[PDB]
């Protein structure tokens, strides 16, 4: 300093979180920014607070510990997917944190997402498993249309093929899948 910028108390706590998420929880409560360490309290703070590192958040929610799993479930429970297409729901969800690397962690996120989506949109799909597998196909499509340096763009035909049989052992309607394809094509997640 001695006259350099001072950080707010909240900004100091956010810095602690971004360095080590679990260390911030007992500090946020101590300082009154967090009511308690219940899954719902923590999940709400993650979603309400600006300036959190999305990779730090994703890694925290993705930890293979039952308490972190509970927080992640609460995090998904805060989303309102009612009336959204599965693409709009996925966009809202995946733009709020960075998915971790290991497949088993990803699967936890995507299964809970699928369950929440079907709970709030009864009659779109008969089974959460349909929304679950479709979500991976949509993530792959998103990558191949907008991000990939090592694959050509995925065609609509290929996207249809990739989802054969997923509706309780039957194909989804072509028009339904074409709609989702275009949603992804026109606005990257």
Swiss-Prot record:
<feature type="domain" description="SEC7">
    <location>
        <begin position="3"/>
        <end position="189"/>
    </location>
</feature>
<comment type="subunit">
    <text>Interacts with ARF1. Interacts (via C-terminus) with RSP5 ubiquitin ligase.</text>
</comment>
<feature type="binding site">
    <location>
        <position position="119"/>
    </location>
    <ligand>
        <name>Mg(2+)</name>
    </ligand>
</feature>
<protein>
    <recommendedName>
        <fullName>ADP-ribosylation factor guanine nucleotide-exchange factor SEC7</fullName>
    </recommendedName>
</protein>
<comment type="function">
    <text>Guanine exchange factor that acts as an activator of ARF1 at the trans-Golgi network and is thus involved in vesicular budding and traffic between compartments of the Golgi apparatus. Activation of Arf (ADP-ribosylation factor) GTPases is essential for vesicle formation via recruitment of cargo adapters and coat proteins necessary for Golgi trafficking. Also plays an essential role in ER-to-Golgi traffic. SEC7 also acts as an effector of two Rab GTPases, YPT1 and YPT31/32.</text>
</comment>
